[PDB]
Design a protein around this ligand. Sequence first.
Ligand SMILES: [Ca+2]
Ligand SMILES: [Ca+2]
Ligand SMILES: [Ca+2]
Ligand SMILES: [Ca+2]
Ligand SMILES: [Ca+2]
Ligand SMILES: [Ca+2]
Ligand SMILES: [Ca+2]
Ligand SMILES: [Ca+2]
Ligand SMILES: [Ca+2]
Ligand SMILES: [Ca+2]
Ligand SMILES: [Ca+2]
Ligand SMILES: [Ca+2]
Lengths: 159, 156, 159, 156, 159, 156, 159, 156, 156, 159, 159, 156
Amino acid sequence: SIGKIWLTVLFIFRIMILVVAAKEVWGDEQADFVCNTLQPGCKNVCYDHYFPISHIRLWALQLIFVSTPALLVAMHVTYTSSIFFRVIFEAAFMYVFYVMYDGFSMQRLVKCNAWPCPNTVDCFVSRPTEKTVFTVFMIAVSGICILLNVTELSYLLIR
Amino acid sequence: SIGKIWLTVLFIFRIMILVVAAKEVWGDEQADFVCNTLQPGCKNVCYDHYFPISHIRLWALQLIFVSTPALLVAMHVTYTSSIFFRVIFEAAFMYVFYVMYDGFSMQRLVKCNAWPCPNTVDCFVSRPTEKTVFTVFMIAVSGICILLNVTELSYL
Amino acid sequence: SIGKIWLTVLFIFRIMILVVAAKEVWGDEQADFVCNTLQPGCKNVCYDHYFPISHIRLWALQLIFVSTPALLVAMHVTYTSSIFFRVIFEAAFMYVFYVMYDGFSMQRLVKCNAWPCPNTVDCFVSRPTEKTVFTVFMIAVSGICILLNVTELSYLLIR
Amino acid sequence: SIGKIWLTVLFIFRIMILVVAAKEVWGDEQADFVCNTLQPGCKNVCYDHYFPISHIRLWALQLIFVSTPALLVAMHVTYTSSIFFRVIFEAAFMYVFYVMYDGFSMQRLVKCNAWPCPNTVDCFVSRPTEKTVFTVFMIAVSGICILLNVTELSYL
Amino acid sequence: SIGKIWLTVLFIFRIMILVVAAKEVWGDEQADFVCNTLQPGCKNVCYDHYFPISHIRLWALQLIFVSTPALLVAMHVTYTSSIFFRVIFEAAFMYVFYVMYDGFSMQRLVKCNAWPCPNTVDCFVSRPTEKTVFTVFMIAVSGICILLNVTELSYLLIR
Amino acid sequence: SIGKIWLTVLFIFRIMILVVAAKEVWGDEQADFVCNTLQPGCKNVCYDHYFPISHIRLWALQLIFVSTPALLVAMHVTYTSSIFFRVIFEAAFMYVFYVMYDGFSMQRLVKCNAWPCPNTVDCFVSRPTEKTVFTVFMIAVSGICILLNVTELSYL
Amino acid sequence: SIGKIWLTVLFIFRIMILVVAAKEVWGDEQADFVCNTLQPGCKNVCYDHYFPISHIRLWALQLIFVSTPALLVAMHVTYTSSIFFRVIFEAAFMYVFYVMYDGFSMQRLVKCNAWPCPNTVDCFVSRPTEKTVFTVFMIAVSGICILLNVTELSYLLIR
Amino acid sequence: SIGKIWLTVLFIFRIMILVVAAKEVWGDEQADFVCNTLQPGCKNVCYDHYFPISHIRLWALQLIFVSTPALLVAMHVTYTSSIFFRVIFEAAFMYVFYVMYDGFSMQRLVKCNAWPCPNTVDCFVSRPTEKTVFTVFMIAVSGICILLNVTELSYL
Amino acid sequence: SIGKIWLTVLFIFRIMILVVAAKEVWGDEQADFVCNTLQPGCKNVCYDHYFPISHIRLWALQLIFVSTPALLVAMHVTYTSSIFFRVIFEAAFMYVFYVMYDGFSMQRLVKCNAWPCPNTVDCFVSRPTEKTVFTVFMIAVSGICILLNVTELSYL
Amino acid sequence: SIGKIWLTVLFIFRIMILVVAAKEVWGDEQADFVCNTLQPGCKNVCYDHYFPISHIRLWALQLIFVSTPALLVAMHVTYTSSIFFRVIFEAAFMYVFYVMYDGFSMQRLVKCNAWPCPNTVDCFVSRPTEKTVFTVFMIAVSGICILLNVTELSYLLIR
Amino acid sequence: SIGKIWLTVLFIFRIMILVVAAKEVWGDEQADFVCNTLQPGCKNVCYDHYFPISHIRLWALQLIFVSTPALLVAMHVTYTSSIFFRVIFEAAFMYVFYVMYDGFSMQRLVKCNAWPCPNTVDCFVSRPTEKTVFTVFMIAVSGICILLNVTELSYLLIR
Amino acid sequence: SIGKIWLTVLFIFRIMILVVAAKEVWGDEQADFVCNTLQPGCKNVCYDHYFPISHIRLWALQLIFVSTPALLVAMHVTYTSSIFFRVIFEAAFMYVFYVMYDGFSMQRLVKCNAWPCPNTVDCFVSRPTEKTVFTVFMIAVSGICILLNVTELSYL
Ligand SMILES: [Ca+2]
Ligand SMILES: [Ca+2]
Ligand SMILES: [Ca+2]
Ligand SMILES: [Ca+2]
Ligand SMILES: [Ca+2]
Ligand SMILES: [Ca+2]
Ligand SMILES: [Ca+2]
Ligand SMILES: [Ca+2]
Ligand SMILES: [Ca+2]
Ligand SMILES: [Ca+2]
Ligand SMILES: [Ca+2]
Ligand SMILES: [Ca+2]
């Protein structure tokens, strides 16, 4: 139960990071996206292909899903049932970060060859290293919040 | 009894989703809209033809219409007659998403030949896949809020 | 007095609509305004001619005038005198919507021939249909808030 | 007694009006300013010559100066000596609107030939009619707040 | 002690002015800065030279320094020691306004000849007269807040 | 005892400073970044090479890391073990400012020849002197918060 | 027969004028044509409407037709038959200058409202007064060459 | 005998006409070609599709082919066998003007949707009426030179 | 007798001068004309107002008019009656250079406010000094050819 | 020897074609060359790769080489030696047209991926079909001038 | 009189050089002139100041003046009088090349500060070294043609 | 005797080659020159540094210098003393092609960092391969004309 503390400490850590991430690091997401091309739509299409669901929004949704269960239990006041969700969700949103983007590392260059683009065009990601760090932290916490939630889970099923 | 728990949770849910949808996903809805043309107005007319009421502003109206009936009650304090509204509205707004936009799926491209345009021209929707995801979540919860209010209806 | 409720219910309905209207639907009002011309000022002038007082601001003022009386009475605590204002104002701001703009329907094209413009230029309104809906609702409520206010008025002069 | 009712109402009134005026009507005051030239700085100098203190920033200062005297009293808690200020200020700011801008009416066009400009050039004010309306409302209430404070002055 | 009032009255006056100053008068500070040149960096460099520390930020810092002492004393609750700071600071930030900018008067034109610039370029300041007024008021108050603080200082050292 | 007074004051201090720094001084950090080139991406790559973590986002992380230990305590309510963190963090972030940026002084110019760029090119940092001032204030207070927490450490 | 001289003197006068006209005065004919519009084709169309057959080419053709007969007779060596042609042609090409262009006077402004053009656009003719003079001379000579040719005609039919 | 008079006259005629046509009327044939697009190559491909052999270069080839047979004779010095060519050539080139260009009349507009173009686009021919006139004169004389050489053929 | 020597020499002189003047000095007369404006047509109208007949095209006409009388004679082969023309023409064209252009000196700048222009605007003549030199040489020789033909006139 | 005539007839045919080819058909050769790219040099490089020696210049050189021998013999006046050159040259310059350009047919599109170009870029040839015809004729004549030259060659070695 | 030959040999040498000079080396004279400025007229004015009379035209005039006398004598056929002109002229046009341009050496950079220019602007001369050579040759010949003309002059006044 | 045959042939040869080279191959020499920069003058200075005397203008001078000696003779009508010049000139101009341009091979790219340029920049020579071919032909014939005049020299 001295871990139910750290959960609250880390639950905020990822938030204030997500804020800094969502606003300064990422900022106007697609505006910063650059492609060597005079082709209209080629940039819009190349962005959609490599970012079906951008990071800030995955993390947005993730934190929304790792929060709804915490609300459910407060409404019943099924507590063990909530812990289950907060794990599979928080872990599911890590699988969607490996698949898609591939490996918690931001690209500096993606070579898109979608339709409007006449040939393969060099699209350049803005500010990747800074973004990378904020993946690490966001993913680290996401990974840690799991362990503490599995612990409290077992602590109920063992005892 | 447990029914009106989820209804407030999912209500709060679809809101935070709607926020992220409006501010980030859609962003400056029309400004991100791109067309292959140099004709002044062709973009504005082809955006009107294909998006007469943007998703965010429908959902905006949706969450408004599905909120008045639950406020009528709070003021009077009829209730069963409000839920009658909370269903048909939330369903009506679901109808205007299949009709218009042609089925909860963002078109990656649309071809408009409205008057200002010299001929038919390519217009490229930005971020269709991500918008598509959020339409699903917004329509799913909408499809869900229907049930809980009908189970509550059939419960009486 | 079960109508003094609906007045409060509709008084908010037009607001949250005005917000959605003022921000998303309309947004940067004149920036979205387009005219086929390389003439500086021709756009600024053509906008002033067809929109002496834009909608969001009429509705802004309208709601300010259909609110000042409600404040006056709270300060006296002349109640029937306040109801009178909330009607003529709310109705006056409907006459200024018929005259000017002509018929609660947004134009898709206005052909301006003001001074800076060399000849008549085709100015294109952005996003008219969406705006039109929000006139209907804003005008509907404006029209309904009248009826309920005239009712309460008569209910005092009859009884 | 009934006098200090309207004074707070109209004070709140002119504020909400001032808001809509600053944020929407005027908007990005200078950015909307357009001139028929390709000279860097001609626009900035012709905006300074004709708008040394933008309407919104005068009214901003106005509502500031007409607020300190009514705060002096609250702190001390003189009062009749504050109203003396609340009149002359609100009137002084009325003087700088006839002088400067040349009579509560927005010029649709101004012709500036300041140094950077090669000659005299057309500069087109955006949205003059709407700004004109709001000047009227801001000056009207200002003209009114004068009376209620003079009636209150003559009342004593 | 009827002066400790006016201090609070003037401490706010400069603020609400600083707000109007920081937002409307100045606004996007460097964006409004114009230079007759096609030289990249020449504008950025010419701005840095003539504005090492812009006004709004000096006033920002000034008010931060003429506030920290007022917080210190509230934490002890050395009261005379705080008055000392609020003077030297508030006065120091007036010396940095004379030196730099030279004389509480905004330039309408500065002729910069820094490196990237090929030759001397005419850089034009936006909206100087309006800014000038707001210096006067900001500096006036700054100058007045001193007198009242020196008075209260002496009132403690004399009595 | 008097030590934990200044620590909260200077903590509040460096915040308001950090605000003005982020919103005004730095502003739109990268957008103000200018390079002498016409190559798409050369600017974005030369900004990544020389600013892998912008000052504001380091300090953002800094004030975050130097805040968790002081929250661990509030929740448990160890304390002496938190101050151990409050020092090393605030010092570690001081190390990444000498390393990276090359010594608390904003470069007025940087010369990047990353791949997209055809050769080495001039890139001009905007507002280096003012940023330099704020780095000093942010590092000074950081250097100070170290002492008060070590005096508090040596005090025990 | 002392007039058959002047015919040769004036036949060259119009030529060297046509050269100066065709090259310097007119020059790149359509390139100099300007229209206040961003509409592609609107300029090309507005030019075709007001200049179905430009001057230099009418004069080119005219001089070709007032020359072919002079060649015919040289080939027979029907002499009176040639004089007839050189008149009707040289006069026909004056009717096509009145009709079309209207009155041997070049416009300074033509207001075209052809299809591609969104509305009526102000198209500006380059260098009209200079062109006008060269019409006068070209038309004067054209008019004089007639008189001398009708004289020689009658001199054969009378005698 | 009188037949071979006009044939040299009209031959010289159609030349001077061809000159004025090439240098002034058509001018820089393709450069004057305008299309409503921003796609690189769409103009070049739509000019190739609709003008595989420009009028001037057909007539150029025409006057070449209708000149060799009259040179064969001068060198040999057969003659009646050359006139056989001087007819069929001058007629064949008349066929490729009805086919291609679709009947001796310059199209004021053509609508091309070749690959590079995103869709069908407006392409505006410059000076169609004047070109039309010269096609008439070039085809008329061509139609005439046929007769004089057939009368000369039937004369034998 | 020696008079008609120089007259042919200086005639050949002013020609070669006129050539260099037209092709190099003046060049593309109007294209080199620059105005401080973004108004379509303001340049074309301000060139018409100030140069109704360009120098080169006057001199072109000049050398034409002063050549016909000397051709009348060659054909007739009256002569003394031609020289009468060769003087008045060459003098008349001298009059239209003082009037118009305002005295054999190229204006470095002209200020035109014809209709299309929003106001008065700077228009900068290119290469005024060099053009000025050639006007002098063209007018000098013109002033000289007058004398030799008047001495020849007074000689008879 | 009635073939030595046709040689002179065809020797001119290719010329007047080359003129029409060099001036109107081809014209400003590289200016008409278009590539979908904002890359400086990418067009210059892509042109050099696909056109090491453009057609008009090959034909220019060809005709220079199929002419020098005809001059040599006129200077001696080794006649059979000249015929030999006029063949191998005229035929060599046909091998350089097959190799390079590949098959007497002009491309409408070439996909260049040379250095300055970021990726493969679509370069568009202007006016290919017209050019193609003029290859056929230029190559036809080139091919015919061979046969007549080999005939006259054999006519000397047989007899 | 074996020098009257070389005069004719050098009189042509400067010509064919002037041609190469006038066309390729110099070419479109002012078009190649570049100035770092967005100021209209500043380039036109800066060109007029540093090139009151460009080289090709001085040489054009020079050769016209060193030719008129050679024509005069042919018309008389005062021979010694012609030699005098061909010297002072050919030498006068060397003084106007020292004064103006200063020293038979073309600038690579001229810093113009004429009126339209806001401040001093860097104007860049195109292709100076090549031009310089052609001054040397044009001036060399000009200098040599003098010596031979003074010789023939003295040869008449001595003998 | 047969030697002075080829010398006139190859002289005429290298001319027609020089023509095609100047007008078509090189064309507008500098205008086709492209550099990756936005600095006014960087292109003009980097063209001067790497092409102080363009190929065409060297060969222009070459054919001039190798023509005077053969004209000295025609006028005098020494001869053997002219051939002495016709060799050294034609050889000297061969030296300034190895030195300068660095060996009869057109550089496809050159990297210039002259003053106006901010740093070293890519400058792309247009049509290097074709120019290379013509340098070969011009230098080959030049290398040949040397022999025939030395054989003619050694013949005496
Ligand atoms: Ca964002
Ligand atoms: Ca939005
Ligand atoms: Ca707005
Ligand atoms: Ca504002
Ligand atoms: Ca700011
Ligand atoms: Ca920022
Ligand atoms: Ca022309
Ligand atoms: Ca052509
Ligand atoms: Ca000219
Ligand atoms: Ca060419
Ligand atoms: Ca030239
Ligand atoms: Ca050239």
